[PDB]
Structures are given as structure tokens and as C-alpha cells.
Scaffold this active site. Structure first.
Site, mmCIF file in Angstrom:
data_model
loop_
_atom_site.group_PDB
_atom_site.id
_atom_site.type_symbol
_atom_site.label_atom_id
_atom_site.label_comp_id
_atom_site.label_asym_id
_atom_site.label_seq_id
_atom_site.Cartn_x
_atom_site.Cartn_y
_atom_site.Cartn_z
ATOM 1 N N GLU A 9 0.813 -1.146 -0.021
ATOM 2 C CA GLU A 9 0.123 -0.038 0.052
ATOM 3 C C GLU A 9 0.639 1.459 -0.045
ATOM 4 O OE1 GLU A 9 -2.740 -1.358 3.017
ATOM 5 O OE2 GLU A 9 -3.732 -2.299 1.216
ATOM 6 N N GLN A 19 9.380 -17.390 -11.562
ATOM 7 C CA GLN A 19 10.712 -17.995 -11.965
ATOM 8 C C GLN A 19 10.793 -19.147 -13.041
ATOM 9 O OE1 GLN A 19 10.955 -19.205 -7.554
ATOM 10 N NE2 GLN A 19 12.075 -20.739 -8.575
ATOM 11 N N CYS A 25 14.504 -18.780 -7.244
ATOM 12 C CA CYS A 25 13.867 -18.177 -5.942
ATOM 13 C C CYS A 25 14.791 -16.961 -5.347
ATOM 14 C CB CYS A 25 13.379 -19.174 -4.902
ATOM 15 S SG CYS A 25 14.799 -20.086 -4.332
ATOM 16 N N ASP A 71 22.039 -13.011 0.144
ATOM 17 C CA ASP A 71 23.012 -12.183 0.444
ATOM 18 C C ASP A 71 24.009 -11.912 -0.572
ATOM 19 O OD1 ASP A 71 21.711 -11.362 2.943
ATOM 20 O OD2 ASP A 71 22.997 -12.608 4.181
ATOM 21 N N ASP A 114 22.062 -8.680 7.861
ATOM 22 C CA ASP A 114 21.553 -10.082 8.435
ATOM 23 C C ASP A 114 20.772 -9.934 9.931
ATOM 24 O OD1 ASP A 114 22.071 -11.752 6.117
ATOM 25 O OD2 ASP A 114 24.259 -12.308 7.087
ATOM 26 N N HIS A 140 7.260 -29.016 1.284
ATOM 27 C CA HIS A 140 6.371 -30.024 1.553
ATOM 28 C C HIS A 140 5.194 -29.521 0.741
ATOM 29 C CE1 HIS A 140 8.095 -30.848 5.466
ATOM 30 N NE2 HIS A 140 8.363 -29.468 5.517
ATOM 31 N N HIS A 163 13.848 -22.122 0.178
ATOM 32 C CA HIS A 163 13.210 -21.188 -0.612
ATOM 33 C C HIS A 163 13.480 -20.073 -0.106
ATOM 34 C CE1 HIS A 163 10.456 -19.845 -3.771
ATOM 35 N NE2 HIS A 163 9.470 -20.114 -3.098
ATOM 36 N N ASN A 187 5.694 -14.637 -3.033
ATOM 37 C CA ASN A 187 6.211 -15.761 -3.778
ATOM 38 C C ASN A 187 6.581 -15.267 -5.192
ATOM 39 O OD1 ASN A 187 7.225 -18.373 -3.786
ATOM 40 N ND2 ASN A 187 5.401 -19.418 -3.731
#
Ligand SMILES: *[C@H](CS(=O)(=O)c1ccccc1)[C@H](CCc1ccccc1)NC(=O)[C@H](Cc1ccccc1)NC(=O)N1CCN(C)CC1
Ligand SMILES: *[C@H](CS(=O)(=O)c1ccccc1)[C@H](CCc1ccccc1)NC(=O)[C@H](Cc1ccccc1)NC(=O)N1CCN(C)CC1
Ligand SMILES: *[C@H](CS(=O)(=O)c1ccccc1)[C@H](CCc1ccccc1)NC(=O)[C@H](Cc1ccccc1)NC(=O)N1CCN(C)CC1
Ligand SMILES: *[C@H](CS(=O)(=O)c1ccccc1)[C@H](CCc1ccccc1)NC(=O)[C@H](Cc1ccccc1)NC(=O)N1CCN(C)CC1
Lengths: 220, 220, 220, 216
Positions: A9, A19, A25, A71, A114, A140, A163, A187
Site C-alpha cells: 500500500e 521464476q 527463487c 546475501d 542479516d 512440503h 526457498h 512468492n
């Protein structure tokens, strides 16, 4: 920190990307975080080139469609002095030789941050920095098949992630419930997957799927 | 692998000890690794006798205060059929004749495993086995005055190690140079050295100080 | 600029002081910068009175132990035509009525210079002027507990500074090509804090902790 | 009593924890003492949930991040019939509704024992019981900045304490005797998160003024 945050927003977030059949990813997570920090710094949202990262950031440790780390991508942008726009260097979903052109660079950074391994720290960062790159255990089939709701997977690992995705905010079930708080996660599997390409991940449930275990963002 | 590991939180690690002015670091490394593997097996953490190793493992190749190897220590415990507790055979910081008493043995092993000389393999071992015996090049003044942060010594050698220590985990923290990863290493110079006797050794920086070059653990 | 600077070695810097339990950091930052510029002008280093500033610079906008600005302190010295020595007007760590005595004045200034808000400009000023008054985000427990090395705090803000301190130099650790760079900063919490009362602050990471956001020095 | 004691060497003490920016020191003092007594009783050292105490022990008088008493925490565990493990109910550094689950309880107590307000009594307790919850005056910057040595603060109060910590032992110089104290400000603070506090110097910082442990 506010009780809910949605950086879409405020203009920090590009549309959902895809991808394809490439394990890139990490590059989409990285461009998402750098898109947000460039917007923070300049007031302009410019979609950034994942292909640039896939093709060119091997020297920083990345392995193209075989995986990488956000990174390392932030390190590439620093070492390289820039990163091309999505428009100038479009996405091909396969690794190619590097075609970086500094004339089309639209982003830069001076390293990365980090965040410590605490969901409280991740919350503060989301609230005060912008979208945050994170890694999650998405290995999963419940994640593959996710369509709506607060994602919770009993077999999710808090330490072994596979991921890279992007936290763009967080929210709650109601103002007075500790239950079913969530991270709002972008994602890179296209907008058919999930909730227009987004997933609400369980928040403050013992670092579910490791979302706070590898959270970072570029220094801009 | 997990992005962070700390076996101290799982109960695998005794308090920091002090070898005194005896070159018995290898024995403290060995007892540390065996303490961890014995705990893995039995659920009991029992401090083990470095003096027993100093006095008794010459036939395996060790030389008391003049140096030794952790693998020779693991071999001794197997050949000898036992190792006395720290309480029963206390540390004197000087080599004497062997006083091993099987009645007070509290540990055993069936050999040892040498880890390939790559930090990638050391990380997998730390993540899945427990604390790992390693050797480092600790012959620099910077190592003496270490107090906090990630230890990095530009003159450190990756092939010529002189000090046996114990990797109890690994992790990361944000730094100026963005070299953020570290091995969590238990030393044997007492609590006043370093961070309560611990040091964060640079991780994934070309096998810094040789930490992955002589890594092993006992089989229990 | 030079690759490294340390104005302490040139005689510009008094010993570390201690503001006590009074929010007078701004006065210690201001006296430190004025001590440096007076030394530059006269070749004599004379410790200056923070209490004089706490008691007397309200008209310029300062609020004693409740906070202030170094620029308001430089404005007071200019308006007032002087500032007393530390010896003549010692520090009491609580606000009192003004007892400035011109007989004991040892400093003056003609205003101040605000440095552009980026670290290249700050480095140029440190290299060509002397110690520089700065404000930093010191509002983290990591800053309280700092011992050695280059301070980098993931949650540090470049906009919300709360603590006035003094940049007395800058330099680098490790190999130069690692870009492990720092600002050398004098604090006013006594010599038991930090590294003898000093902290090395992250340099050239996009204005970490806001060190370049409110940098200035007095005109003598 | 022995000339020196260090319950860490006997397996009574978990690693140093960090309360973060929440005034929950009392809960870390309490879990520390209960961890020690649970180990004394069972031989298992299991990290216990400060969050459980922060969220749930209000009826005993505790106030979450706004302060509490170790004795109130011990009373809660008794009233509640249990206390969850750190792993099952990890620390959030902010107060929330109570999420206690009896299926994950790993600790219990039957009340608590307050120690007389004397350092000789505290020594006897450390020597014979295990780690002891205590409160100290930590409201001085010398304590914030502590790194090494025997902590002594001329301005410390023996009557006005503000910080719950854990005495895990004591020792001597060979003058300058000390209590070995585990804090809850993480490992960077002090000596790996520990402090040696002056022992037998007129109850320095009030270390013997509010000492107690749980009955297991
Ligand atoms: C993307 C994740 S994915 O491909 O979208 C996916 C698919 C199905 C289920 C879940 C996720 C990549 C996948 C890389 C890969 C390619 C081929 C075979 C297996 C995997 N994932 C990564 O790149 C991860 C991301 C990551 C970031 C930070 C922390 C943890 C994980 N990293 C990775 O795989 N690496 C990292 C380092 N190195 C350069 C190579 C291995
Ligand atoms: C302990 C190291 S130390 O003493 O703590 C120390 C002190 C200062 C700086 C660095 C380290 C010992 C030292 C032995 C020694 C004593 C006196 C003079 C010279 C040396 N180190 C060892 O025992 C090393 C450890 C090691 C293990 C595995 C791989 C590499 C190193 N090993 C060792 O020295 N030897 C010599 C004899 N022995 C049969 C084989 C290996
Ligand atoms: C000193 C900082 S401190 O007290 O040493 C400290 C302690 C712990 C952690 C960090 C810092 C003072 C504190 C003032 C204060 C007192 C009581 C409650 C809150 C704050 N800080 C200031 O004086 C800052 C310095 C500064 C200068 C320039 C830019 C940004 C900050 N200024 C301040 O607080 N002001 C300025 C204006 N006005 C006169 C009062 C508010
Ligand atoms: C922990 C101490 S602290 O936060 O770590 C700290 C920080 C800096 C310096 C020293 C200590 C808490 C702090 C509570 C607090 C929060 C916010 C504002 C003010 C205070 N301390 C307590 O909880 C103390 C501990 C204690 C125990 C036994 C005897 C004396 C003190 N107790 C306390 O604060 N109480 C007691 C009971 N009542 C329910 C609330 C006030």
C-alpha cells in the site's frame, strides 16, 4: 511496531513474478528486497533484473538455476556497482552468459544486513525497514498446493530452509487474538499460485518454517 | 544444513576448562568431543580426564604437554577400553606416569571419523553429529586479546595448525565487512579469555586458520 | 582524504570524560570539538567546561540534562564571547544556575559549520578540520555492551539519533581490500565503557547509525 | 561449607539467556533456580519457559515485562501444577495471553524457601541447595558496562534492589571474595553473561536481601 503492515500500500512492491522452471527463487527474493530499499531511498519503484543476478553473480557464490543466496546477490550489486532493470535485462528462466550493461543500471547497494534469528526482530525490521528477504522450508506439498488461509505445516523445519521469498508485511486474525497471526509473503511462482501469488505464513509460532532464520535486506 | 547450531543448548558441552601452561590442547579437544558423543548416547554429561590422556596415550602417538592429536586420543580410549572421569583423575597441567583406573572409567569409544577437509563437510558434521574436534592456527597475538566478534587473522595459515579446540556450533551476525558467518569454538584457556572462553572463528572464508583441515569426532 | 586519521596522536583530544546520569552528551560532544579547534588555533589543549554549557546555553535552545544540540552550544560560545575551562567550572552532572566567569574563559568561536549529510563529506571534514561533533543512534543494548571491534547494529537508524559524540578519526581493520572500515569515536561514558571509552563505528555503510546526519564543528 | 562452589560444573545450569527489552529478569531468575532444583531432583537439565511465567503468573502478583518476584513465579508453578519447557513455549520478550499446555510441562514445585537476609546464610544455601534466585541493585552504569573482575559499586544499595539474577556459586581471590552470578542479558554482557559480585562486603548490592529457591 504497528499491529499490521502491508508495504504494497506504500508503493514498495512490484507485481508478482514467476521464476519458471529455474531454481532462481533467491534472485526474486533479492530483487524484491532491493526494489523496496531503492523505493525507500529514491521514491521510485523500478522492477529489477533477476536474469542479471542469475547470469552474473556466480563470483559472489550464486549458482544460477541451481540455487543461491539473497546475501550473495546483495554482494554482487555492491561489487558490480549496479544492477540492471527488469525491462533492460528480461527474465529467461535459464542461465546464460552475463550481459550486464552499466548504462541500464537502476539500483545499487553498499552491502546487506542479516537480522538476528528472532521473529520479534523480524517484525521490527518489517515495520521499520520495508520488505525483507527470508528463506523458508517450502519443501512440503502443502506449500505447493497452498491456495488461501494461514499456512501452517506440522512437519516444517525452523532450521533447514530451501526457498527464498519476500516478507512484505504482517497481520492478525483480530485485534485481541494471539492466534493465527501471519507474515504476508510474496512468492515468485506467478499469481495463480496461492493468494494472487502471496501466502500468509504462521507468525509467532516458534519461528514456523524458519522464516526468521535467514532474514536479510540490502544496505541502501 | 541449518543456518545456526549451538550444541550447548542441547546439553552436550561441559564448562570451559583451563589447560594451564601445558601444551595439552589436543586432550581438551578430545575430551570435549567425547563428552558430546557420550551425552548423545547416554543422556549424561560427565566431564572427562585430560590428565588421563596426557599421562597414558603416548603409545598411540601423543606426547603429553609437548603436543598430540585428537585422533590418537580417541584411539587410546578404544585401545584402553575406557577413560576416567575428570573428578577421579584431575588435571595437573604436567605429564606424569599413567594412573588410569578402570573402575573409574565413565566413557568409551569404538574409533573415530575424520571429516573431509572442506568447511562444507565440517558444517554437515557439526549439524548432525555434535561438537567436533578441530585444529586451528592460533599462533598470533590477535588470538590472545580476543574479546568479542568474529575472529579473522589475515596472516592465519590453513595448513599449519598448532591448537586443538572444539567446534560446538556455528551461526552469523551482521558485521561491517559483511563477512558474517562464524564457527562457535570452545577454547581451553579458561573463562577469562575471549567470550567466556569461547571464540567466534570466521566461517566460509577459505578455511580460515585451517579449522576444517583436521576435524574429527569419536564413535560411541 | 588520508587512508586513516587519529587526531589523538596530534594532541587535539582530551581524555575520556563521564557525563554521569545526566543527558548532557551534547555538551561533551561540543566541548570535544571546540577543544580540537582551539588546539588547531593556538597549539594548546585545554579541557573545556561541560557544566558551563549545561547551566548557561538555555537561551540558545539547550535543555541541560534533558538534551541539547552541539550547534546550540557553539552558538552559546559565540553569543557569550567565551567558555570556561573544565578546571575553573567543573562538571557536576546536574543542571544549576549559570556561573560563567569571563576571567576563566579559554575558548571562543564565531559560529559553526554543518557538514553535508553523507560520509564522504564527513571524512573530508575529519581529515581537514579536526575532531567533528556527530550524533548517533546509540539506543541499543549492543551499544551499552560494546567491547571491541567495529560496531554494526542491524537495527541502527540513520534518521533517529539520540546521542552526541565526537569523531576523532577513522581507519580500517584487516586487509584494506576487505573494506573493513570504521569511524573512531570518543564517547562520554567513562573509560570503563567500550574500548577505553572509545568505539569504532561502522563506516561507509550508508550512514550507519546516522553518524553523518548531524555532524558539525565550531568556527574559531 | 566448601571454600568455592560452581554449580555449572555439576550440570545444574543452562546456557545464558537474553531477556531482551522486557523487564522479565524475575522470570529468568526463577527458571534458573527451578532448572537447578529440577536437575537436583531428576538428573535432567531442561530449559524452562520464561514466557510461560510472563504470560501466566499474573494471579500470583507478577506483572510481565513490568516486573515481578521470583517467589511469585515459584508460587505460580505450584498453583498451576506445572511449567512448560523453553522449547515448547519459547521466549517472545513481550507479554501475551497465557498459552500454558500441561502436556508440555517438565517442571513442578511445592512452594519455595526464603533465605535469611545474611550473606552467611546465602553461602550455606548455595553450598547445600544449588543455584539460588537473588535480587540486586543493578541500577548503576558500572553494572551495565561490566566485563571482568569482582564487581563492586560504591553507590550500590543493600535495600533497594531492581534486578533478579541467579547465584550459581562463589569463590575467593586466594579479600575480594565473590558470588558467581548468572545474568540474563545475553553472552556479550560481562564474562560470557556472568558477573563476579563482591561477597562478604556488607551485603553489597543487596544480594542477600531477597534470596530464595523453589521446593521440588
Ligand atoms: C529456489 C527455491 S524453489 O526452486 O522455488 C522450490 C521449489 C520447490 C519447493 C521449494 C522451493 C532455490 C531452489 C534451488 C534448487 C535448484 C535445484 C535443485 C534444488 C534446489 N532455492 C535456493 O536457492 C536456496 C534458497 C535459500 C536461501 C537462503 C537460505 C536458505 C535457502 N538456496 C540454495 O538452494 N543454495 C544456496 C547456496 N548455494 C549457492 C547453492 C545452494
Ligand atoms: C596445544 C596448543 S597450545 O599450547 O595451547 C597453544 C599455545 C599458544 C598458541 C597456540 C597454541 C598443543 C601445543 C603443543 C606444543 C607444546 C610446546 C611446544 C610446541 C608445541 N598443540 C598440539 O598438540 C597440536 C594440535 C594439533 C592437532 C591436530 C592437528 C594439528 C595440531 N599438535 C601437535 O603439536 N603435535 C605435535 C606432536 N604430536 C605427536 C603430533 C601433533
Ligand atoms: C545524551 C544522550 S545519553 O544520555 O548519553 C544516552 C544514554 C543512553 C543511550 C543513548 C544515549 C542526550 C540525552 C537527552 C535525553 C535526556 C533524557 C531523556 C531523553 C533524552 N541526547 C541529546 O541531547 C540529543 C543529542 C542529539 C544531537 C543532535 C542530533 C540528535 C541528537 N539531543 C536531544 O536529545 N534533544 C535535542 C533538542 N532539545 C534541546 C532537546 C532534545
Ligand atoms: C528486571 C530487571 S531489568 O529490566 O533487567 C534491569 C534493567 C536495567 C537495570 C537493572 C535492571 C525487572 C525490571 C522491572 C521493571 C520494568 C520496567 C520498569 C521498571 C521496572 N526487575 C524486577 O522485576 C524486580 C526484581 C526484584 C525481585 C525481587 C526483589 C526485588 C526486585 N522486581 C520488580 O520490579 N517488581 C516487584 C513486584 N511487582 C510485581 C512489580 C515491581
Amino acid at each position: 511496531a504497528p499491529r499490521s503492515v502491508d508495504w504494497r500500500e506504500k508503493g514498495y512492491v512490484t507485481p508478482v513474478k514467476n521464476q519458471g522452471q529455474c531454481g532462481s527463487c533467491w534472485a526474486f527474493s533479492a530483487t524484491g528486497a532491493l526494489e523496496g530499499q531503492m523505493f525507500r531511498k529514491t521514491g521510485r519503484l523500478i522492477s529489477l533484473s533477476e536474469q542479471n543476478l542469475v547470469d552474473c553473480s556466480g563470483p559472489q557464490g550464486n549458482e544460477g538455476c541451481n540455487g543461491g543466496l539473497m546475501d550473495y546477490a546483495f554482494q554482487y550489486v555492491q561489487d558490480n556497482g549496479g544492477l540492471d532493470s527488469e525491462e533492460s535485462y528480461p527474465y529467461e528462466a535459464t542461465e546464460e552468459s552475463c550481459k550486464y550493461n552499466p548504462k541500464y543500471s537502476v539500483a545499487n547497494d553498499a552491502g546487506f544486513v542479516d537480522i538476528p534469528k528472532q521473529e520479534k526482530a523480524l517484525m521490527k525490521a518489517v515495520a521499520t525497514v520495508g520488505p525483507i528477504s527470508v528463506a523458508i522450508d517450502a519443501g512440503h506439498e502443502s506449500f505447493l498446493f497452498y491456495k488461501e488461509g494461514i499456512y501452517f505445516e506440522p512437519d516444517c523445519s525452523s532450521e533447514d530452509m530451501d526457498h527464498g521469498v519476500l516478507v512484505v508485511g504482517y497481520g492478525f486474525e483480530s485485534t485481541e487474538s494471539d492466534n493465527n497471526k501471519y507474515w504476508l509473503v510474496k512468492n515468485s511462482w506467478g499469481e495463480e499460485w496461492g493468494m494472487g501469488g502471496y501466502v500468509k505464513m504462521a507468525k509467532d509460532r516458534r519461528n514456523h518454517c524458519g522464516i526468521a532464520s535467514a532474514a536479510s535486506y540490502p544496505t541502501v
